[PDB]
Design a protein around this nucleic acid. Structure first.
Ligand SMILES: [Mg+2]
Ligand SMILES: [Zn+2]
Ligand SMILES: [Zn+2]
Ligand SMILES: [Zn+2]
Lengths: 65, 196, 141, 559, 159, 133, 49, 168, 114, 263, 85, 43
RNA sequence: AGGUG
DNA sequence: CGATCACCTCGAT
């Protein structure tokens, strides 16, 4: 359910990195690890944030009203 | 709780600054005690952590499937390839002083579950309230503002203590207590209460 | 095409099952000291083979990472707990009217998964978060 | 049963319990809301009039306040409503139902209440947050932990009722238990683990920390002890700064194994006046031992003084450890490359001893001893052969574990872990049993349909060759699950039965008490014992003592 | 079996000895067998010890048994506690069980017994036999909502 | 007070029994053919190799709250490199003439045996050990 | 993601819990304890499907 | 030798040694008469039952029989001098300290001794794990233990599961 | 629910004053200052700087419970020296070090390129 | 200059690597702490929800809004609302933001921090401008809208510190290391065979000399020279995180010095 | 009837724990209800602390009726009873 | 939910025990602790 | 019933 | 004629 703003552990803004990550995976066709590092997510607390996120909102938006 | 039979309540909440910290500046979201490990023998918990650390670093999903040839060595080999000490240990500095802890901490990511059973849904206190019609005793349940049961098992501890009056207070002043009239002849509750 | 068959405990009585396709039926003639010790092919008069011994487990247990490295009761205890754990129970949650519904704000797909989780739809509807955790004696709280 | 022997009661609270290292042994951490709910009827006397009047002014929503004012004629003044809630000019003889305040005695409990120690009087400490807070050392008598346990709290309503709690039920009084004639509380977990670490010969602390540690002790005399070292740096040993928590006039001697007054291994224990001379402080000293510091201090210095001792030791050790740190990794289960080889071949030669004994049984060369079956003897042998393997394999691991091994460290302190734990986690799990026999042939002449018929081999009948580190195979896994289940099965069936036993015992002995003639009589005044326990001594005031006229040689008795 | 027996020089010595262990009980007959120590013969059947040797011996074996359950568990309970229980079952002359058949049938107060088991029927026979309840018991005072003659209430306080 | 005992010892063996800062020393006096010493030394602060020749001194001089030395003008009774403060715990006589004394320096143990110890080493919470070269 | 397998009775979702019973028409032999006169018994829980 | 008894004499002695600063190098100011007769007096003062009559007098004598065995073995003339190196002052204090601690050690009338016993047995019974035994590895060591055995005992089991007869 | 307001960590209440000076009973020329609404950030920093003063015999601080922001600082000085002066000088020494640090960082920052 | 010494290794718009030589660990840490928790910033501290026909809950959004970085450059020329004499908020103590979004398009509509609009009187001070570091020019995805979906709300951004709520930290992780050789012997390494082989070398080892094999332990040595890396969220620039850090610390020490004068 | 004379008394000369708790309790109850204090207060306000001092200074005018198992009793004043403990 | 829909109940020699024959049919772990331990099974 | 210890 | 203590929650008639 939607990309968290900021990493719970440290605070680095991650809420602006999602769409960018998705283009890096789909359009650039790179692997998650190189995708995360290209966005500038050096620490593993910041890595799990995006890598471990499930974007349930896309499914929720499918609900008619 | 973790996915390894490790249930535990929040003891206290520390902000980022008071928390122990990595040379990288990483800080735990959670601190679990070493004493929860030896007797419980939940080794997979420790392995999940090693794997999950490697997984977050490399940007891959860790294969924690049972009957596989995934070894602690194999994982350790990959974690070191990421410039970390192979067994999950990390040098950590004290949040209060900045001084390095003499001990290195097994630090890394572990999948933790938020369970039900939350203090606020459990807390109850009663100091006089609703009384059941028949028994004239405090009602039952938090949802009804009930009285905590002081069972016979509890009555026993008080007898053991030799606290004769507290035991009388629990069963009279708090809870029950009623004034009846007795006939000196038959000794029954036949005396008609015509007070005033 | 009869490449797979349905067996109950009654028929199980009369058959010889291999645990793995490979390690249980190739040939015979150094090792990895890290890897666990497995017996052998030995009894070689097989009629069947196990699809996957991970399949001996059900839903709640199929969620545990490496239960094969855990004490048997901890695996039972966890199975009870996972059912008390919050998460996105269903995508339609907003449209339902249930007596109590606990939904996690930012659920996370675990960094440590089981192959069985793919079928259990766990990484699509998770029930927990990947917390950065330190095993340590701190303030003693 | 549910309305006369027991009943639901007013002035009772309950919540989730949590641990507090900054709380006193005899204290109880009560949430503000709870303190604000539960009240004590306090009669207006010139002694309290000023405080009571003010508390009535604070009202029911501000904490050190009250709800209800009881005047003569009977009527209650509800402080939450009432137009005169701000008015109220109190009179002596009126009662003020004031909120529960710091230091009030309260009856604290945890179910099942199978002990007099499961119910104790604690000193109130009104604190924020929703959990009841308690000192880790009061955990054991209640048999509590913080995995989600809930505790009950009761409030005395009379002056005599609160006297009964403080004079009979108080936590410091319950320290030395009559059940086992030893204490029922001691130093546990981080404090037990840290104390060992702090107490080593190697452990040396500098001024900066020394002073902080010294200050942390509240009773501190204010005197900086002369450091044990005044060489190219002043250094205080851990023993030194910890001996500050121990009071004066305290003497303790032990002798473990190699203890020789020169204690080369730093074993045994020697405390003179109140300074630890030698010996690493672990469970034997600081646990709930028969001849422990606690038993000694309660007897020598008093209940309320020994209660202080917990806090003092806690405060130093907790702090020192907060700064030293301690952890447990996956590395603490890893045993040497060469150690694993030996463990592996240990199990391999056990496997052969089993195979040969089997080969022997099959040849009719096996002869069973009088009283048992040819098969009974075989199984009894194999089971023994295989247990020896696990014990030898685990011992090989324990030996390889360094003094820096965090699991070994806990075992050494006595905080958590025993041999088995080391063994099963790092060397070999071992044989699994059900109904006290190795894995049975559930299928016809086989344990699993992966085996052939009549296979009495270790692997087939439930021997777990692997350690939790290596990982269990599907068969091993299932077999361990079968054994594992058996545990949970009786665990359950025990409590339903042990509970009934407890009741019956209690019911049968309810009325047995010591009368004013040292005689032990029932409700009929029938003699049970003429002298209680045959000596007329209270169980808590007793302790194991060596009678020196019984043992020794006739020659040594003479000398 | 291992035995702690004193040596001729004074010190207690570890001298091993042969001991027979039986499946079944016939104490009366086995103790009269020539070649044994009839002073030392034992049985886990405390009831058989009671019938053959007497109530006092039965009491010694009854404790030895209770003790042995606690001991085998690794636990330790002070003598006085099991001593008491054992005496309670013993003082009656025979072996009164810790059940409704045993202690609950005793000459104790009608209200104090009805609190354990057979609740209504205890009060029923109390009515017919026209029982007078002593009110010296804990249970009766607990029911009667009075300060029981327990510790604090085991004496009267006067001016 | 002043010195209670002073001697030059010859180290024979040095052992770190599962310790990294501490070592138990074994030495006999170069003068007296019976006078021995067994003592725990902090080899991190002052190392001791085997066969070393050290000068040992038991004093009782240079009681109230400890004050940091403060070089200002404070001159302590040492031209030494290693100093410890401890307590006497046992005065065991090893028969006839031979007598031993037990000292603990916050748990760093010391046993010294001979005969001429006498009226000097008494039951005192006071005891200073001093080592040089 | 819903899997079904349940019912909806007066708005509430109901799960019928699978009930474990001993199979019928099966012959089974059992030894009988010491005070009993019959040493062994052969049983058949016969029923019509 | 080791048995739970009131008044830890060892500690009392240790306390006297520290308090009075006992010097093992100086001869004691005691007498054989002071020790021998002193201990004999202390014994007469270890009260449990205050009745001046014969029955109660012997009941009292019986109750202190074992503790006096300890007292005598510990406070023997050779031991008081050779071992402890006590002084008349330290010795006199030891005597009065034992008497006081003994009277403190005595059970209090009103003590709910019955409930105490029941709970003292009941609590460790719930703590009992394994209805089986640690003897499970051996064949001729299989006797009913744990909660089932404790159940057999309390119920006064006419037909116990493992009736055994140990012959000497 | 029973959780206190987060501003209570840095905001003083009614009646609550920052410093509370209390003469120590156990030792001469010793004082116990109670810093209100202040954690380890100030405690440890002041305690470490007091240790630099040669005329300071003792300096140790403590956070008696983590729920509350307050901390206790014990200072013992030599005769003639008031511990309130020891605290004063310690505080100034800190300011002077911090002042220097600010300028030094600024001079370096203005050299960098990015 | 005089006391503590600084040597900037690398500097960027978001990070500062530097060496803090001639300083005490107590100061190094107190600075590290105060950087994390006590530098005041500006963050949304009130959400007035006019309309919410969205997938997400009001508070769920309100919470994310608080987490959005806002320009905190001239935060010192803005009052803490508690100190302000106004009833509630004003221009001297707050900044008012507006979020109006509606899914006009068939395709999924996205809501960004760029979509927040300042309504308050700014009075020429660098404040409340949502921090955008995103390449496309729209930082932080607040929400996603379908079609009929609309979100109308109003934000009151206020002055505050992380010590009250984590949203107020100009924060991010601060790297902190001293003595990369354990010459101080401040930590005892856990090993299996070799500590040196099993523990990886820190990049800061290059800036120091190894223990030099058979050398006696330097007991008297104390911790000075600390390797740090301050990362900024964006609200306040890097220099200012450290500069304000030192400043807050001076200010809080000065308050004690001042509290002594009052008594 | 029944009673036992002051001379000839087998009961403990020392006060029991149950005896003092009931005593301090009863005395505290009286103090709380504005009864006169038989000891000088040292800035004391708590009814139990005052009862504790009144016992410490042996000025509690209460007597314990020690019932024996036959029914007979022995009257022991707080003044005579030894409060060792 | 999935777990609930795959539950077994056994009303009323050793039914609570994980039998050999349960292999690959009923879960070796998933069972309630106490009261109905080993009577409530999961597929 | 469904669960918490 | 028995058959662990206490505690929560639900929806039933
Ligand atoms: Mg628990
Ligand atoms: Zn991060
Ligand atoms: Zn009538
Ligand atoms: Zn304003």
């Amino acid at each position: 359910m939607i990309v968290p703003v900021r990493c719970f552990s440290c605070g680095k803004v991650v809420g602006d990195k999602w769409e960018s990550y998705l283009n890096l995976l789909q359009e650039d066709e790179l692997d998650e690890g190189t995708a995360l590092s290209r966005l500038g997510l050096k620490r593993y607390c910041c890595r799990r944030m995006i890598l471990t996120h499930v974007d349930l909102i896309e499914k929720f938006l499918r609900y008619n009203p | 709780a973790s996915r390894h039979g490790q249930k535990g309540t929040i003891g206290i909440t520390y902000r980022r600054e008071d928390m122990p910290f990595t040379a990288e500046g990483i800080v735990p979201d959670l601190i679990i005690n070493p004493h929860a490990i030896p007797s419980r023998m939940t080794v997979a918990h420790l392995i999940e952590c090693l794997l999950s650390k490697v997984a977050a670093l490399s940007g891959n999903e860790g294969d924690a499937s049972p009957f596989t040839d995934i070894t602690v060595e194999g994982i350790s080999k990959l974690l070191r390839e990421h410039g970390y000490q192979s067994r999950g240990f990390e040098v950590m500095y004290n949040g209060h002083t900045g001084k390095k802890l003499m001990a290195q901490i097994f630090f890394g990511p572990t999948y933790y579950q938020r369970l039900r059973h939350m203090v606020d849904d459990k807390i109850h206190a009663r100091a006089r309230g609703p009384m059941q019609v028949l028994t004239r005793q405090p009602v039952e349940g938090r949802s009804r503002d009930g009285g905590l049961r002081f069972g016979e098992m509890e009555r026993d501890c008080m007898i053991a203590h030799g606290a004769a009056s507290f035991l009388k207070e629990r069963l009279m002043e708090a809870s029950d207590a009623f004034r009846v009239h007795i006939c000196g002849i038959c000794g029954l509750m036949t005396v008609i209460a015509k007070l005033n | 095409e009869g490449l797979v068959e349905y067996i109950d405990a009654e028929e199980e009585e009369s058959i010889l099952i291999a645990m793995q396709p490979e390690d249980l039926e190739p040939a015979e003639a150094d090792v990895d000291p890290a890897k666990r010790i497995r017996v052998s092919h030995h009894a070689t008069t097989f009629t069947h083979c196990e699809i996957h011994p991970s399949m001996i487990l059900g839903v709640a247990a199929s969620i545990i990472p490496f239960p094969d490295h855990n004490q048997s009761p901890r695996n039972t205890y966890q199975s009870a707990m996972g059912k008390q754990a919050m998460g996105v129970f269903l995508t339609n949650y907003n449209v339902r009217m249930d007596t109590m519904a606990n939904i996690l704000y930012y659920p996370q797909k675990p960094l440590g998964t089981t192959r069985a989780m793919e079928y259990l739809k766990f990484r699509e509807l998770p029930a927990g978060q990947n917390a950065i955790v330190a095993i340590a004696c701190y303030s003693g709280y | 049963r549910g309305n006369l022997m027991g009943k639901r009661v007013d002035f009772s609270a309950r919540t989730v319990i949590s641990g507090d290292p900054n709380l006193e042994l005899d204290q109880v951490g009560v949430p503000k809301s709870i303190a604000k709910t539960l009240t004590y009827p306090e009669v207006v006397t010139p002694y309290n009039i000023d405080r009571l009047t003010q508390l009535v002014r604070n009202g029911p929503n501000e904490h050190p306040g009250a709800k209800y004012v009881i005047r003569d004629s009977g009527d209650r003044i509800d402080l939450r409503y009432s137009k005169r809630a701000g008015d109220i000019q109190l009179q002596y003889g009126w009662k003020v139902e004031r909120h529960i305040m710091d230091n009030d005695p309260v009856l604290f409990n945890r179910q099942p209440s199978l002990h007099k120690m499961s119910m104790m009087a604690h000193r109130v400490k009104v604190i924020p947050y929703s959990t009841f807070r308690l000192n880790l050392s009061v955990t054991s008598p209640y048999n509590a932990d913080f995995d989600g346990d809930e505790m009950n709290l009761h409030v005395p309503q009379s002056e005599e009722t609160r006297a009964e709690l403080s004079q009979l039920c108080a936590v410091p009084l319950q320290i030395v238990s009559p059940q086992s004639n030893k204490p029922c509380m001691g130093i546990v977990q981080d404090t037990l683990c840290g104390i060992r670490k702090l107490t080593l010969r190697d452990t040396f602390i500098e001024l900066d920390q020394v002073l902080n540690m010294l200050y942390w002790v509240p009773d501190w005399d204010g005197v900086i002890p002369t450091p044990a070292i005044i060489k190219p740096k002043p250094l205080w040993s851990g023993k030194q700064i910890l001996s500050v928590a121990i009071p004066n006039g305290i003497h303790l001697q032990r002798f473990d194994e190699g203890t020789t007054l020169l204690s080369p291994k730093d074993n045994g224990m020697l405390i003179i006046d109140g300074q630890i001379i030698f010996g690493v402080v672990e469970k034997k000293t600081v646990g709930s031992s028969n001849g422990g510091l606690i038993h000694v201090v309660t007897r020598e210095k008093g209940p309320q003084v020994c209660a202080k001792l917990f806090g003092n030791i806690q405060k130093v050790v907790n702090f020192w450890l907060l700064h030293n740190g301690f952890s447990t990794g996956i590395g603490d289960t890893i045993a040497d490359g060469p150690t694993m080889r030996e463990i592996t071949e240990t199990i391999a030669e056990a496997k052969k001893k089993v195979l040969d004994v089997t080969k022997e049984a099959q040849a009719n060369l096996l002869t069973a001893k009088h009283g048992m079956t040819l098969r009974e003897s075989f199984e009894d042998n194999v089971v023994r052969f295989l247990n020896e393997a696990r014990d030898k394999a685990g011992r090989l691991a324990e030996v390889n574990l360094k003094d820096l091994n965090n699991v070994k460290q806990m075992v050494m302190a006595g905080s958590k872990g025993s041999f088995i734990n080391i063994a099963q986690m790092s060397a070999c799990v071992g044989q699994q049993s059900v109904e006290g026999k190795r894995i049975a042939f559930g299928f016809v002449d086989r344990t699993l349909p992966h085996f052939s018929k009549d296979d009495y081999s270790p692997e087939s009948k439930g021997f777990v060759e692997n350690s939790y580190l290596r990982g269990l195979t599907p068969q091993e896994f299932f077999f361990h699950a079968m054994g594992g289940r058996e545990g949970l099965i009786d665990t359950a069936v025990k409590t339903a039965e042990t509970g009934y036993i407890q009741r019956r015992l209690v019911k049968a002995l309810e009325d047995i008490m010591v009368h004013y003639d040292n005689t032990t009589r029932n409700s009929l005044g029938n003699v049970i014992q003429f002298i209680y326990g045959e000596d007329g001594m209270d169980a808590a005031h007793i302790e194991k003592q060596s009678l020196d006229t019984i043992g020794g040689s006739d020659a040594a008795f003479e000398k | 079996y291992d035995r702690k027996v004193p040596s001729p020089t004074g010190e207690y010595v570890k001298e091993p000895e042969w001991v027979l262990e039986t499946d079944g009980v016939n104490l009366s007959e086995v103790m009269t067998v020539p070649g044994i120590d009839p002073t030392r013969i034992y049985t886990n059947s405390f009831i058989d010890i009671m019938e053959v040797l007497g109530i006092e011996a039965g009491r010694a074996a009854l404790y030895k048994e209770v003790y042995n359950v606690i001991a085998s568990d690794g636990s330790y309970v002070n003598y006085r506690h099991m001593a008491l229980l054992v005496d309670v079952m013993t003082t009656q002359g025979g072996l009164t069980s810790v059940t409704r058949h045993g202690f609950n049938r005793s000459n104790t107060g009608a209200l104090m017994r009805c609190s354990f088991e057979e609740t209504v029927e205890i009060l029923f026979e109390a009515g017919a036999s026209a029982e007078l309840d002593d009110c010296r018991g804990v249970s009766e005072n607990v029911i009667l909502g009075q300060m029981a003659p327990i510790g604090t209430g085991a004496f009267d306080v006067m001016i | 007070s002043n010195t209670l005992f002073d001697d030059i010892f010859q180290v024979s063996e040095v052992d770190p029994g599962r310790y990294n800062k501490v070592c138990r020393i074994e030495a006999a006096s170069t003068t007296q053919d019976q006078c021995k010493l067994t003592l725990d030394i902090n080899v991190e602060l002052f190392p001791v190799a085997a066969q070393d020749s050290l000068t040992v001194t038991i004093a009782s001089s240079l009681t109230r709250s400890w004050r940091p030395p403060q070089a200002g003008d404070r001159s302590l009774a040492d031209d030494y490199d290693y100093v410890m403060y401890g307590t006497a715990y046992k005065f065991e006589e090893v028969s006839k003439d031979l007598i031993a004394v037990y000292y603990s320096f916050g748990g760093l143990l010391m046993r010294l045996e001979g005969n001429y110890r006498n009226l000097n080493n008494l039951k005192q919470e006071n005891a200073y050990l001093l080592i040089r070269r | 993601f819903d899997m079904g397998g349940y019912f909806i009775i007066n708005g509430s979702e109901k799960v019928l819990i699978a009930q474990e019973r001993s199979a019928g028409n099966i012959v089974q032999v059992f030894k009988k304890a010491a005070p009993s006169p019959i040493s062994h018994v052969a049983e058949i829980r016969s029923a019509l499907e | 030798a080791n048995w739970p008894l009131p008044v830890n004499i060892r500690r009392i002695i240790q306390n006297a040694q520290q308090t009075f600063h006992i010097d093992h190098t100086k001869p004691s100011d005691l007498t054989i008469k002071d020790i021998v007769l002193g201990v004999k007096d202390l014994q007469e003062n270890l009260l449990v039952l205050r009745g001046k009559n014969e029955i109660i007098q012997n009941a009292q004598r019986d109750a202190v029989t074992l503790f006096c065995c300890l007292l005598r073995s510990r406070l023997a003339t050779r031991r008081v001098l050779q071992e402890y190196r006590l002084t008349k002052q330290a010795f006199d204090w030891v005597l009065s300290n034992i008497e006081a601690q003994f009277l403190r050690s005595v059970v209090h009338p009103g003590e709910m001794v019955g409930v105490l016993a029941a709970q003292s047995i009941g609590e460790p019974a719930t703590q009992m794990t394994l209805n089986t035994f640690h003897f499970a590895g051996v064949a001729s060591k299989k006797v009913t233990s744990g909660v089932p055995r404790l159940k057999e005992i309390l119920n006064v089991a006419k037909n116990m599961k493992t009736p055994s007869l140990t012959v000497y | 629910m029973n959780a206190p307001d987060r501003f209570e960590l840095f905001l003083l209440g009614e009646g609550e004053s920052k410093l509370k000076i209390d003469p120590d009973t156990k030792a001469p020329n010793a004082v116990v200052i109670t810093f209100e609404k202040e954690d380890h950030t100030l405690g440890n920093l002041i305690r470490a700087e007091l240790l630099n003063d040669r005329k300071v015999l003792f300096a140790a601080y403590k956070v008696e419970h983590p729920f509350f922001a307050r901390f206790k600082l014990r200072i013992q000085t030599t005769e003639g020296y008031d511990p309130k002066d020891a605290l004063k000088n310690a505080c100034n020494s800190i300011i002077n070090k911090l002042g220097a640090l600010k300028t030094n960082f600024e001079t370096e920052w203005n050299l960098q390129t990015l | 200059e005089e006391g503590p010494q600084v040597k900037i290794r690398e500097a960027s718009k978001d990070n500062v690597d530097f060496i803090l030589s001639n300083v005490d660990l107590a100061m190094a840490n107190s600075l590290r702490r105060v950087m994390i928790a006590e530098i005041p910033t500006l963050a949304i501290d009130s959400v007035e929800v006019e309309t919410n026909t969205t997938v997400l809950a009001d508070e769920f959004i309100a919470h994310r809004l608080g987490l959005i970085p806002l320009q905190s450059m001239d935060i010192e020329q803005l009052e803490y609302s508690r100190d302000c004499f106004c009833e509630d908020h004003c221009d001297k103590c707050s900044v008012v933001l507006t979020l109006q979004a509606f899914g006009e398009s068939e395709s999924t509509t996205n809501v960004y921090s760029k979509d927040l609009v300042i309504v308050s009187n700014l009075m020429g001070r660098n404040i409340g401008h949502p921090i955008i570091q995103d390449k496309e020019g729209n930082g932080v995805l607040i929400c996603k809208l379908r079609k009929g979906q609309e979100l109308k709300l109003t934000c009151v951004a206020k002055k505050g510190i992380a010590k009250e709520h984590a949203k107020w930290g100009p924060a991010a992780a601060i790297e902190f290391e001293y003595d990369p050789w354990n010459k101080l012997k401040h930590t005892d390494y856990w090993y299996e065979q070799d500590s040196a082989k099993e523990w990886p070398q820190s990049k800061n080892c290059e800036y120091e000399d190894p223990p030099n094999e058979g050398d006696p332990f330097d007991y008297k040595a104390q911790a000075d020279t600390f390797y740090m890396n301050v990362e900024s969220v964006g609200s306040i620039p890097v220099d200012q995180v450290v500069v304000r850090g030192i400043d807050t610390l001076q200010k809080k020490v000065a308050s004690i010095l001042l509290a002594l004068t009052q008594m | 009837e029944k009673a036992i004379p002051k001379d000839q008394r087998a009961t403990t000369p020392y006060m029991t724990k149950y005896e003092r708790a009931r005593i301090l309790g009863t005395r505290a109850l009286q103090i709380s209800m504005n009864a006169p204090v038989f000891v000088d207060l040292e800035g004391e306000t708590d009814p139990l602390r005052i009862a504790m001092k009144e016992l410490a200074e042996k000025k509690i005018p209460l007597v314990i009726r020690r019932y024996l198992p036959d029914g007979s009793f022995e009257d022991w004043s707080v003044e005579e009873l030894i409060v060792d403990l | 939910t999935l777990s609930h829909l795959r539950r077994t109940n056994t009303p009323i020699a050793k039914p609570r025990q994980l039998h050999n024959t349960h292999w690959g049919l009923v879960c070796p772990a998933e069972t309630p602790e106490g009261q109905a331990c080993g009577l409530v099974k999961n597929l």
